[PDB]
């Protein structure tokens, strides 16, 4: 059965599944949790960072791609570096060549296409990392969810990682609320923090644990780590 149809991404199973891609989707499911949510003026990313021992640092989950775009990762970090680096480049090309800020919708389309190429050719391997992209462009605030299968979706809020389903329900409920926190950054963040705190279990979110990112109207993508997230626990 399996070891027959799961050795290469180039192999379709008898039911039309791509196992390597599905196995890629799994590495995301064991990564730490991160939340994304947006109002009509700001988009925030909240991510629970995970350590290896109590003597190590908490691996970063958020990466700035331009002054108006960034993302949080879950899964294989190196892959996130590869993809966020591509995003950085594409963003840069738009500014240099057209003096235009890259649209999040466009960024999403590009990420999909890059991931797809790795799912139709032999020898390669799908990317094993998920990303939540937030950005503020000409059409307002945005949140996008990228999956290694190549499926990119634009959302109001969401979450990925282990126990993601927890925060995914809080947001699914709190929608009518947060989608209206306009002109109030700290609130949106708080909403995000509340959302992320619904997928916890092990410990409580601490100053070494939390990572938040916010972008919006008059706010360039800025990352708040440790020291400056104290006011949100």
């Amino acid at each position: 059965f399996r070891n027959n149809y799961d050795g290469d991404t180039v192999t379709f199973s008898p039911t039309g599944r791509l196992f390597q891609v599905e196995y890629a989707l799994e590495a995301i499911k064991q990564g730490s949790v991160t939340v994304g949510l947006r109002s009509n003026t700001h988009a925030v990313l909240v991510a629970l960072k995970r350590n290896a021992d109590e003597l190590s640092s908490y691996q970063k989950k958020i990466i700035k791609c331009d002054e108006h775009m960034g993302l949080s990762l879950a899964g294989l970090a190196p892959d996130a570096r590869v993809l966020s680096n591509y995003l950085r480049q594409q963003c840069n090309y738009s500014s240099l060549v057209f003096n235009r800020k890259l649209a999040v919708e466009r960024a999403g389309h590009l990420l999909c296409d890059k991931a797809q190429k790795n799912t139709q050719s032999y020898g390669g391997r799908p990317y094993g990392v998920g990303l939540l992209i937030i950005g503020y462009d000409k059409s307002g605030a945005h949140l996008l969810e990228f999956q290694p299968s190549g499926n990119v979706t634009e959302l109001y809020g969401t979450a990925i990682g282990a126990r993601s389903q927890g925060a995914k329900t809080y947001l699914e409920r709190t929608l009518d609320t947060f989608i209206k926190i306009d002109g109030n950054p700290d609130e949106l963040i708080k909403a995000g923090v509340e959302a992320i705190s619904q997928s916890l279990r092990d410990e409580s979110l601490t100053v070494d644990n939390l990572s938040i990112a916010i972008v919006g109207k008059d706010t360039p993508f800025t990352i708040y780590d440790g020291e400056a997230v104290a006011k949100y626990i």
């Binding site: 799961d6 390597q20 890629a24 064991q30 640092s57 570096r81 190429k117 020898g123 391997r125």
Partner: protein, 242 residues
Amino acid sequence: DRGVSTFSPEGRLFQVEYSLEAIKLGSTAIGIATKEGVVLGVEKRATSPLLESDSIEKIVEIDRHIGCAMSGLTADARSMIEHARTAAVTHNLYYDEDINVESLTQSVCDLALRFGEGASGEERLMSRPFGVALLIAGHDADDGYQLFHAEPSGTFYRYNAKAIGSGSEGAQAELLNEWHSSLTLKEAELLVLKILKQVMEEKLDENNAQLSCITKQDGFKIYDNEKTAELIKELKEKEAAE
């Protein structure tokens, strides 16, 4: 058979996971970071008594402000060190300054997953992951003394103290208990020596273990056997008290 960049049903890259197993069969390496420097110590582990121990290179200089210890298939680390040194020097050339330790480490880890058979994405030629892990330690003006553990997965974590190699589970455990935000360079040297002594198969002496440290003032220095022996002696005495 089955590809080299294949994902397991659990979402782990086979070769990378199998790579980490080869690392568990290597000599122990310990680095401890304080506020007066970072100490790196390694277990030499010669295959026979006719081997001139000083030809065993497991702690290497990357640049005056960065040194590193290895564990695993030590031969695989030669290309890594080469890249590390070239990256540090090149940065000095392009920017007339010292490369940040994190940057040096990230550059090294960028090599990691560059393995495969025509893996559609870019040109990655290396038939398999590296079979060695590194402890990279150094100092830069922005983040001070730092120690990093660089794995063949491409991930690297900063640690206050870290052990890699065969006796790492045991050693790491001792590290967890002995490390504190106010250790001194001498205290650190001692611990590395002590912990190395615990997990090693052979009795630790100045010929089968090696120390080194990296400090703002003097940079990377591998401790000469004589300096270490005095430290080993200084240890036998501190332990024989209570």
